Amino acid sequence: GLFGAIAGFIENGWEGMIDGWYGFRHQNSEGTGQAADLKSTQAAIDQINGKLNRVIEKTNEKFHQIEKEFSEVEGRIQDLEKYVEDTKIDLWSYNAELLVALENQHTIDLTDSEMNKLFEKTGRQLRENAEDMGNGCFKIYHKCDNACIESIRNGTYDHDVYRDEALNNRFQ
Amino acid sequence: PGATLCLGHHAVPNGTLVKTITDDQIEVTNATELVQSSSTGKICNNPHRILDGIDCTLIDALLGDPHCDVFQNETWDLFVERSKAFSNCYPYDVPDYASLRSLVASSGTLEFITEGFTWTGVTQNGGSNACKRGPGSGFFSRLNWLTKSGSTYPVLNVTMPNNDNFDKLYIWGVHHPSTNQEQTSLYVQASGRVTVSTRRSQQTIIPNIGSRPWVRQASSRISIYWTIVKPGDVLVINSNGNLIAPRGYFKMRTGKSSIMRSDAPIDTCISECITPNGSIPNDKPFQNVNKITYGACPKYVKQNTLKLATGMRNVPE
Ligand SMILES: *[C@@H]1O[C@H](CO)[C@@H](O[C@@H]2O[C@H](CO)[C@@H](O[C@@H]3O[C@H](CO)[C@@H](O)[C@H](O)[C@@H]3O)[C@H](O)[C@H]2NC(C)=O)[C@H](O)[C@H]1NC(C)=O
Ligand SMILES: CC(=O)N[C@H]1[C@H]([C@H](O)[C@H](O)CO)O[C@@](OC[C@H]2O[C@@H](O)[C@H](O)[C@@H](O)[C@H]2O)(C(=O)O)C[C@@H]1O
Ligand SMILES: *[C@@H]1O[C@H](CO)[C@@H](O[C@@H]2O[C@H](CO)[C@@H](O)[C@H](O)[C@H]2NC(C)=O)[C@H](O)[C@H]1NC(C)=O
Numbered sequence: 001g002l003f004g005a006i007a008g009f010i011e012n013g014w015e016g017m018i019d020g021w022y023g024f025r026h027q028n029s030e031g032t033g034q035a036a037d038l039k040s041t042q043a044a045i046d047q048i049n050g051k052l053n054r055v056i057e058k059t060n061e062k063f064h065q066i067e068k069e070f071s072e073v074e075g076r077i078q079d080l081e082k083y084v085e086d087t088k089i090d091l092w093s094y095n096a097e098l099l100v101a102l103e104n105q106h107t108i109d110l111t112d113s114e115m116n117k118l119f120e121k122t123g124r125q126l127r128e129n130a131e132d133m134g135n136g137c138f139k140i141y142h143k144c145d146n147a148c149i150e151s152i153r154n155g156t157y158d159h160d161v162y163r164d165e166a167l168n169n170r171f172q
Numbered sequence: 173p174g175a176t177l178c179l180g181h182h183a184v185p186n187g188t189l190v191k192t193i194t195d196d197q198i199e200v201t202n203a204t205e206l207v208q209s210s211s212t213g214k215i216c217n218n219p220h221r222i223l224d225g226i227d228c229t230l231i232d233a234l235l236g237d238p239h240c241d242v243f244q245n246e247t248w249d250l251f252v253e254r255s256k257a258f259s260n261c262y263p264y265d266v267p268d269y270a271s272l273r274s275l276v277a278s279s280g281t282l283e284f285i286t287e288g289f290t291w292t293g294v295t296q297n298g299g300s301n302a303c304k305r306g307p308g309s310g311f312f313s314r315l316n317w318l319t320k321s322g323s324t325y326p327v328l329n330v331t332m333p334n335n336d337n338f339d340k341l342y343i344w345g346v347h348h349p350s351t352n353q354e355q356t357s358l359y360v361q362a363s364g365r366v367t368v369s370t371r372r373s374q375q376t377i378i379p380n381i382g383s384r385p386w387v388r389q390a391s392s393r394i395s396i397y398w399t400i401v402k403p404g405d406v407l408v409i410n411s412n413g414n415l416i417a418p419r420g421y422f423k424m425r426t427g428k429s430s431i432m433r434s435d436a437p438i439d440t441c442i443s444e445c446i447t448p449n450g451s452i453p454n455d456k457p458f459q460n461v462n463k464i465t466y467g468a469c470p471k472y473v474k475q476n477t478l479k480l481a482t483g484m485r486n487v488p489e
């Protein structure tokens with residue numbers, strides 16, 4: 001995708017994450033654990049629901065039309081009736097092919113984008129108390145117990161609290 | 173002693189392939205189908221009024237072939253013609269059959285109003301063993317076969333004004349005998365003539381005498397014509413022989429009515445979209461079942477599948 005996260009600097013997905021589309025894995029003093037990020041997950045889902053509902057939006061209702069199958073050879077008029085229908089079908093078939101191509105390219109790019117948005121948001125939360133390893137993982141340079149992780153994940157992590165500690169561990 | 177915090181995304185073990193601008197096939201976590209490719213094989217009887225033609229074409233129901241008498245004054249949203257349909261009355265043709273079928277199908281009714289035509293000096297209600305009504309000879313219910321009274325067939329000249337505020341459809345015809353003996357025996361004059369007119373139009377038909385292939389006991393034929401009379405206009409019928417006269421008119425409507433050729437059985441269910449293969453759901457925007465449809469239907473396309481991605485790129489472990 002355009003943002004280079006999904007199938008990019010993040011090597012692969014997590015089959016184990018079943019409660020969300022994007023989220024967090026951590027290792028600290030107290031062990032390892034996993035949690036879904038709801039906001040990013042919902043942003044992707046809402047956008048996909050949006051496009052799905054636009055695409056399946058019932059556009060047409062038709063009643064008496066032209067005949068499209070014929071039991072006798074007639075020539076000119078029937079040639080025209082068939083050509084009109086064949087022309088229509090090819091144009092609709094093209095629209096359908098193009099629609100899914102554009103939709104799907106965009107769906108991949110937007111999901112890639114939401115991964116990236118969450119990554120950049122987290123980086124910004126952590127300020128000078130962590131560093132980007134380049135594989136979608138931050139090395140946090142301080143004691144971050146389960147309370148501290150959950151604070152990063154739920155948006156309450158004050159960086160000023162751990163700054164002195166983390167700055168020291170970084171610049172050695 | 174610090175901590176590692178990894179950002180990531182889900183994957184699934186068995187993804188689905190979709191098409192994009194750049195890729196013929198690329199794997200995503202999930203997709204949904206946009207092409208309806210199946211039918212139940214049955215035409216749902218709601219919410220459209222479905223009229224099963226059974227053994228009758230719309231035209232035979234219109235003319236009043238005796239085995240189609242059950243269709244008198246019927247109405248429909250969709251008239252369904254079956255491949256088993258057959259004619260069983262006097263042999264006939266309709267120049268521009270397709271147009272008459274279309275305009276009637278589209279009107280959605282066979283509501284017929286009898287009018288008091290006065291045919292002075294001819295015998296009315298002619299019939300044939302080609303068109304049995306009960307045990308005896310008969311004819312199309314909506315047509316009146318006129319022949320000589322005594323030894324004369326005078327010039328018929330009649331009018332019927334339209335003083336209603338709707339259009340009238342008149343169905344009428346011309347008899348084509350096989351021999352000169354038949355012509356003179358039925359109509360006296362050696363050559364007949366039928367002129368049907370309004371203020372705006374006129375049709376004149378000369379009968380042709382000659383054998384046609386034998387069908388249901390006759391080498392003769394009837395040719396069927398139609399005339400629409402608008403409010404304030406007047407019908408005139410003029411003939412010195414061979415007239416197959418109207419008994420009245422059909423009331424015309426405009427609306428959502430049509431006709432479809434199908435052998436699918438009718439069932440009790442609800443479906444907006446009908447194809448000759450049967451009803452189909454209309455939750456998807458496209459369909460590959462049949463280019464012939466009626467109602468709120470997905471648009472016909474040539475592809476049998478098109479997958480809309482409903483998830484991210486699938487990158488498994
Ligand atoms: C066959 O039937 C038609 C229909 O009735 C006959 O048409 C009628 O012919 C008469 C006279 O021949 C027309 O009368 C005219 O009326 C106007 C006023 O509208 C009057 O000013 C004239 O002096 C004239 O008398 C009458 O309008 C006409 N009716 C219609 C509906 O067209 C026709 O005459 C019959 N043909 C034969 C050969 O008998
Ligand atoms: C209105 C009328 O004259 N009805 C006749 C009918 C017509 O004269 C005929 O269909 C015109 O094409 O003919 C009927 O007879 C069929 C029968 O007639 C014999 O004369 C002949 O020997 C047979 O081969 C056969 O044509 C008919 O039923 O069609 C009688 C009807 O009263
Ligand atoms: C719906 O009915 C149409 C018309 O009968 C089917 O079209 C036929 O498809 C078969 C392929 O299985 C061909 O052999 C025929 O030549 C086709 N005929 C026409 C006129 O196109 C169609 O396959 C049916 N579709 C479904 C889903 O039942």
Ligand SMILES: *[C@@H]1O[C@H](CO)[C@@H](O)[C@H](O)[C@H]1NC(C)=O
Nearest residue numbers: 018201202203204205482483
């Ligand atoms: C993915 O879509 C399918 C239908 O195409 C659906 O059955 C399934 O529940 C969806 N996946 C999830 C995780 O909801």
